[PDB]
Amino acid sequence: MVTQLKSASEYDSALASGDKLVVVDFFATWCGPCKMIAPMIEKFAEQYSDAAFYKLDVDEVSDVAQKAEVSSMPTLIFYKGGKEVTRVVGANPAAIKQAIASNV
């Protein structure tokens, strides 16, 4: 399943009592994987049974991107215990399966 984070509440409450797998995606659609991998991760979303896909850009939100400083392209992270433990900031689809399928 794919989610759309419009309000910080959807993100905050997700890191609090969020035991399941909480995935985040920070990409301002510059040019490259950020747009080429969109279908990949978005497509894999229909593969998992309990994977929270949090989509975030920059201006569209301005809340998360503000606090959660981005240092990649794109920038994906995995939250299991309300704390970034298994992050994945690079560029590779397969990295989502072995990642999501792990924390799942």
Curated annotation (Swiss-Prot):
What do we know about how this protein assembles, alone or with others? Monomer. Part of the heterodimeric LMA1 complex together with the proteinase inhibitor PBI2. LMA1 binds to the ATPase SEC18.
Q: Where is the active site?
A: C31, C34
| Thioredoxin domain residues | 2-104
Q: Which residues form a coiled coil?
A: none
Name the Gene Ontology molecular function terms of this record: disulfide oxidoreductase activity; protein-disulfide reductase activity
Q: Which SUPFAM superfamilies match?
A: Thioredoxin-like (SSF52833)
Swiss-Prot/TrEMBL site (Deprotonates C-terminal active site Cys) positions: D25
**How does it get modified after it is made?**
Reversible disulfide bond formation between Cys-31 and Cys-34, reverted by thioredoxin reductase TRR1 using NADPH as hydrogen donor.
Q: Where is this site: Contributes to redox potential value?
A: G32, P33
Q: What else is known?
A: Present with 17237 molecules/cell in log phase SD medium.
**Lineage start:** Eukaryota, Fungi, Dikarya, Ascomycota, Saccharomycotina
Cite the Pfam families for this sequence.
Answer: Thioredoxin
Q: Which residues carry this modification: Phosphoserine?
A: S62
Write out the entry's keywords from A to Z.
Answer: Cytoplasm, Deoxyribonucleotide synthesis, Disulfide bond, Electron transport, Golgi apparatus, Isopeptide bond, Membrane, Nucleus, Phosphoprotein, Protein transport, Redox-active center, Transport, Ubl conjugation
Q: What is its induction behaviour? A: Strongly induced by hydrogen peroxide and diamide stress in a YAP1- and SKN7-dependent manner. Also induced by reducing stress by DTT.
Q: What is this protein called?
A: Thioredoxin-2
NCBIfam families in the cross-refs:
thioredoxin (TIGR01068)
